[PDB]
Amino acid sequence: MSSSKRIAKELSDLERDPPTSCSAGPVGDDLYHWQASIMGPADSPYAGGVFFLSIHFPTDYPFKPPKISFTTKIYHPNINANGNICLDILKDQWSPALTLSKVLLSICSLLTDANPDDPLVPEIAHIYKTDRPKYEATAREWTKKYAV
């Protein structure tokens, strides 16, 4: 009811004013399980790649954050092998005032500017802090293979 109408509202807002590089909507007619895709920023080792996200809205949304997993394989210090993303606003900083499109933005940005202080993958984090080139080189490789 409050959960069903809040998601319908957000879907409708997109169904009108469409984002540019982001693209999201429900899978099938399941209003609680969405799928989305985004392109890697131009100034990132993910540039040109296409990433698919899986989205699960909590039954008590928007008072509880949505579950966002990455479908595509990505080499990022804040994203692990299962697609989990360590992002502040998907947890401790979540708030009913935020939207999914707002969550998508913070993600386009996370890829542009990772956060080595939230080492969800310590190996990728260390390579990041000390040998940025090795990391940027490996990020682009994985983009060619998977982000297509």
From Swiss-Prot:
Name of the top EC class for this enzyme: transferase
GO cellular-component term (any): nucleus
Protein name: Ubiquitin-conjugating enzyme E2 4
Superkingdom of source: Eukaryota
Pfam family, one: UQ_con
SMART domains: UBCc
Keyword list, A-Z: ATP-binding, Isopeptide bond, Nucleotide-binding, Phosphoprotein, Stress response, Transferase, Ubl conjugation, Ubl conjugation pathway
Signal peptide: none
Database matches in PROSITE patterns: UBC_1, UBC_2
Documented EC number(s): 2.3.2.23
Task of the protein: E2 ubiquitin-conjugating enzyme that catalyzes the covalent attachment of ubiquitin to other proteins. Mediates the selective degradation of short-lived and abnormal proteins. Mediates ubiquitination of PEX5.
The family this protein is said to belong to: Belongs to the ubiquitin-conjugating enzyme family.
Catalytic activity: S-ubiquitinyl-[E1 ubiquitin-activating enzyme]-L-cysteine + [E2 ubiquitin-conjugating enzyme]-L-cysteine = [E1 ubiquitin-activating enzyme]-L-cysteine + S-ubiquitinyl-[E2 ubiquitin-conjugating enzyme]-L-cysteine
UniProt pathway: Protein modification; protein ubiquitination
Gene Ontology BP, a term: ribosome-associated ubiquitin-dependent protein catabolic process
